[PDB]
Amino acid sequence: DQLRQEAEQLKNQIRDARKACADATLSQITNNIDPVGRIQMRTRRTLRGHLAKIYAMHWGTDSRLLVSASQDGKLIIWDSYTTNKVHAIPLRSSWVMTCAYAPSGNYVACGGLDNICSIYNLKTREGNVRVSRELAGHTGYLSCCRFLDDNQIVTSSGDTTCALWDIETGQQTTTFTGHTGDVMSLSLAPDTRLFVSGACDASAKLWDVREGMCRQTFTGHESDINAICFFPNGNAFATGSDDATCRLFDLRADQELMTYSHDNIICGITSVSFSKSGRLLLAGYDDFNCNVWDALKADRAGVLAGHDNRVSCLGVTDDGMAVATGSWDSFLKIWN
Template identity: 35%
Template sequence: MTEFMTAKYIDVSSKMEQINERIRLAKQETEILNQQIIKVNTRLNDRNLIETASNIMSLPPDYNANSKNSTLKLYKTLTGHSEKIANIRWNKDSRHLLSASQDGYMIIWDTLSGLKTNAIELDSEWVLTCAYSPNGQLVASGGLKNNCTVYNVVVNKLLFHPQRANNYISSSGSGVNGVESYPMSKINVNRSQYAAVFKGHKCYISDCEFINNNQILTASGDLTCALWDIARGSRVREFTQHLGDVLSLAVQPATSNPLFVSGSADGIARVWDLRKPTPVQWYHVSKSDITTMKFFPESYSFATGSDDDMIRFYDLKADRELSEYTLPRTLQQLHRSKRQSHYPNINRTSGAGGDGASSLRAPGNTGHFGTDSSSSTNSSIYSSIDSLGVISIDFSSSGRLMYACYADLSCVVWDTLKAEVLGQIEGHSGRINQVSVSPDGKSVCTASWDDTIKIWIP
């Protein structure tokens, strides 16, 4: 019996080796074919966006937020969270802002007054993302618990007396400057206002976004995206074809049947029609993780940010890359020196099968994507939380400015037409990990690991 089991084990191991070898060869062939496609497309492309805009005047480089002559002015600093802020989302009214923090709360802010209107207690403090419905009546969160939880927003009275507008909430309820503050338990805290809880994903949820007031889209470390119906509490469709953890997504704005684009640890951006389970377009972006994505205001172009510190701009109609944005050498050197001082024990390595996929590896973690599921999850969780490259992107309402957060390098302001750096938004004491422009384009919001949010006025 023992000899039989041993022979069976050897036979299974041999078959697995054969399968892995076939996968390796298939990936190698795919890469060769992809390079051939890139060469053909390159011959057809007469010029890129930067060359086309060569006759357009450059914008003045006066977007350094700490400068006296800066175009950006600090309007308000929102304080109240007691841990890192993971994500922020604007309401469609351009006044209210949703923030999700690892203190276990989401807070809805009135950005004009700086007051809080709601505090929502999360089902897990390990939150990675949040979303705001178009009508402002629902919010959602997702994270390491593998669930996407949708909450009803209860709108009641103001949180503060107008004369106490400078107070802030802390998790302990303590005040500042000797002035009384109110504990979370007394500030419109939603504890049981669940609209839906979606549990279909097998791994962490890295991103989520409302399609409309009844549907929400999620991206997960289980290599899939999913569309959910809130009223029915069920999954409508699953989107599968990524070969690595899906780390980011972006929904096409202002369209009745929007497309969405997803970015993954496999370095590929896939464009999906919500009505179809397979992608309608795809772009081989990078050999490293795609950590953030954002649609351009005109809805038919999008930008990707990845762990290789590169931002790439794609157009759906032209079906190609339009431009790349690389940090100037001085900023690259500063970025690398800060990275090495903050992450001395984390190495960047190529993924399994020789595909060159980049991952973050914690000390002692020797796994690769595609060979060990637990180490793959760990690697991409590090990419979701501790990304070393571009971590957030957004555009001004005209699209001329692009705001990009880099790990350990604050928020950089780009001229999208000239690929020139116009300045940096600084002022936080910790990493600026999120940037978001209000829908009306009149405010820029930055969130940080220093537990604060800042509102800037262009």
């Protein structure tokens, strides 16, 4: 109908509005800042026991325990201080793509090519880990899952939708639609009232958990987005795509701020994360390496080499003491 031309009008209006708000680039304002300098981090621990590629990890809230998921159908909980194994949960399906840790430390979740999110009760009255709840209803593979609290969980799948579940009953309360391609990542806000999702339509979207509607849409990338992560402030986030570039978007300014690219890098980004103060941006790559970026400068400050295969997962502790990188060569590494 005429609706196509009306949509085109609104698209052009939005672009004009954001152009007015642009008065000075992040680089100009942060030019005076003294460079952070070279960063030298070194493997402190190496965790071994996985016999296949590791696809995900998630730190505990106490910055001591962590969970890892691997293609050999194992969910191992480690003790990063002493490299001890605390649990080893066998999965019914070995095609697992994501894992989570409850903010209390009482539950873990996993999912993958089977379109099911499975929740496991860690601390029970018998000391044996059993599957408490399996949540079904997605049409495509499960890409990511984050524990909102001890009772609610947010998941994203390949059916171009995200959902909010109620673990006690098992039915999804809210469904978030609007994405055009597969949703690949997800990140909750510090106050757990908003979250962002990156999809294969080269667009990120901000969602309201309570209302279930899309507030803002960000589109600067040229290919699918593999990773997303909120700034510690909660007013910005960073994206990683197959375009071999990272980008920082701000919610209030509603536009891109800075780009983290190098002509020597041609491989895509698999995972991104920030530091405690937000001054560092750590990103894993397909060239077997992790690159530290200066979030306020777009200048590299170090390289965490040491993995023999593709770095697939990456996470920084709540207290910011250490960073853990897992990879396709079945090895975890805590760097600090």
